[PDB]
Symmetry: D2
Subunit: 39 residues, 4 copies
């Protein structure tokens, strides 16, 4: 897959953005119908 | 422990809804299951 | 108009609020003005 | 300090870039100037 890079200033911001990235990754691979059941 | 956020405009709403929905999702999918879904696709 | 969002937790709320305010700022500052700030304060 | 964040896929890269550029802009715009732009 097409891989990209971002420079992030500050450690807290990196932690926040790394969490968003990982969260978005999971949402992309969980069918919406599975996701409504987990909710 | 609940707050409501005011969002001005549709484009910001969709971005911020998306992020919020995604974080909540990570709070309710089990670690082993999340891994399965990432392996699969 | 106005949309509202139910956010769970103080920490998550502060993060999404900061993001909201940052996107707002980005929308009303011209790119030309942005680069002037990015160059002079960094 | 500076960190490098790897992202897979165009969709996600664009969203995260948008957020990160936004965060950085608000680190260099004075509080006073920021509220003037919001009022304008
Ligand atoms: Zn399971």
């Amino acid at each position: 897959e097409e891989i990209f890079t971002l420079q992030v200033r500050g450690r807290e911001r990196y932690e926040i953005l790394k969490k968003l990235n990982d969260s978005l990754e999971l949402s992309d691979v969980v069918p919406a119908s599975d996701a409504e059941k987990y909710r």
